[PDB]
Amino acid sequence: SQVRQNFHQDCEAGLNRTVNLKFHSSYVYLSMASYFNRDDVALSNFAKFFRERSEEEKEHAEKLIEYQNQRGGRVFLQSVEKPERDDWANGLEALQTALKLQKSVNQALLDLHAVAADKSDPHMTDFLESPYLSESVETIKKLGDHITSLKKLWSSHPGMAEYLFNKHTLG
Amino acid sequence: SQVRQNFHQDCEAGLNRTVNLKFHSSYVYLSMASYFNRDDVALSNFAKFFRERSEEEKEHAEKLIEYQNQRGGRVFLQSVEKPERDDWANGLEALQTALKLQKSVNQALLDLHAVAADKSDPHMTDFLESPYLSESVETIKKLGDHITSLKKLWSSHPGMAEYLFNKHTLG
Amino acid sequence: SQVRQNFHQDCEAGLNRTVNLKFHSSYVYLSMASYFNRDDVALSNFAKFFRERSEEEKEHAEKLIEYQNQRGGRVFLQSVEKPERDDWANGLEALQTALKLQKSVNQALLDLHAVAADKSDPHMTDFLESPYLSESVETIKKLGDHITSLKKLWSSHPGMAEYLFNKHTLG
Amino acid sequence: SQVRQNFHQDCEAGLNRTVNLKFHSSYVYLSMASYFNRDDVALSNFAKFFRERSEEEKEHAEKLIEYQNQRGGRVFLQSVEKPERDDWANGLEALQTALKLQKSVNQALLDLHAVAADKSDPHMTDFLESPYLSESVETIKKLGDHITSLKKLWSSHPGMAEYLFNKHTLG
Fold first, then answer.
1. Are the beta carbons of A99 and C71 separated by less than 8 Å?
2. Where along chain C do its domains lie?
3. Which of B72, B78, B82 lies closest to C77 in CB terms?
């Protein structure tokens, strides 16, 4: 590419691997959103929350593809594996799964950042820091807070816990 | 000081002692605010409430310093002792601690007022009455009310108590 | 903490040490502001300037506490040592002291940044760079400029120097 | 008087004595204002400043007369002695004289307040506290500040001192 400069093959490859990860996360959130809209689950604000997370992950994936093109790298798309589950049990289990998902995506971004740093690519480390790394920790803190609040309510009554949380925290 | 008139040394000293007390209270509230923002506590409106109390105590301290200068007294700042605890247990314990703190600060203001009265300084007694003494009793009444409401909820479920109070009273 | 990830103990500790430093700086500036409001000093714009510096240092301290919570670290507050002096001599001596203070705080931020870099924490190095490190150098340059201008005037008449500078540069 | 209640003869008399004092102060300030408007003095902002002080003292005198009537006391006006000087030397000497005048008026208000307190008249002590006692200390602090600033300039050149102060502080 006539545009390529100081762009290492490992960074190009890591980038392609990361967009797949982001699409997979988006897909997991979409599954969760759909689950909460089921007539036998009916937690509309949990659904809304996960739907928003889904769209955010999707937009990140698209921005990474755009970054690949900007640097003169070549995009290679892979199949997107379906979520690990189709039933997410309940609001608390879904939140806990999301925290685990967010931390694995954060680790992937940190690993990619380390590759860019090792290859001395300041443009890429800068790109990864904001907003990718920053949004990750913000989301992780938010999910941790949510889990704590829901757990407090859970100890009294799980049925009422989900209903009240859906209304007061997610509404 | 060319400006000094009817300003007794004991009032000057009491004033310096009181600004330290006010800074210490501010610091205690800041500690509480930070505690409620912890991911494992997550009561944002309790945090907000204590953050506001912190700023109010800080502004009072600054107004007392300003009063010292106005009367021709000389400000002497002392080290600000850290809060007695770093962990505040829960919303109810924090509220009860704040009531105790507010009453000790109120007593200090009453003692200072008595010194000013004894020395026949009507400018200072007037200054202390509004808004210092008035805000103290208003805050004390507010905290007493809060404690009563939270205790009512506590008897059912502490987890749900803090969650509901954080949302409905402090939100 | 369920939220903690890639957050080293040394960074957590350095953070707690830095908030204390920031509170101490705020306290030093407050002392200076109060000194310039004395009837026998009477340089209102110097007071205003240091009052603003005080509030800025305080807000930085609070943002660092907030950052600690975001990463899953635990805040530990220590006593805030009183300023080294209660009398700041004059406008020039105060400015020179502030430059020295700013450079020591800058060094602390640089040392903390180095710890974060050593531990491979890109989220923290990024956080420290803007606005902390950037504001430091901006403030340092501003103070250096002020000192130079005041020194030019000082050589003629210190009394007139402070009066004119208070009005034209700080006003 | 059908309206009189808890109004002691000594308070009534002190009130009449104080309105005369206030008229005399107003007259002194008027003399100063006129002096600074002389073609051979020509400090328009010093004149403006003293003119304002004159009007303030006059309005206080009128409010005290009004208070006398409100309580059922009877107003007795006495001759207003002319100022002690017709020539006020310079801006610094005038400022120093005003500080001395303000402190003597403040003492008179404090003495009157003490009489009201001794006679258990809370309506009168309250009336005297705001705005009379409060304005006195504010004015005293302001004059002390002004004197300090002008003295700083005086040490360099008195001619330039008055000119610059007239423009920058009083303008």
1. no
2. 1-171
3. B82
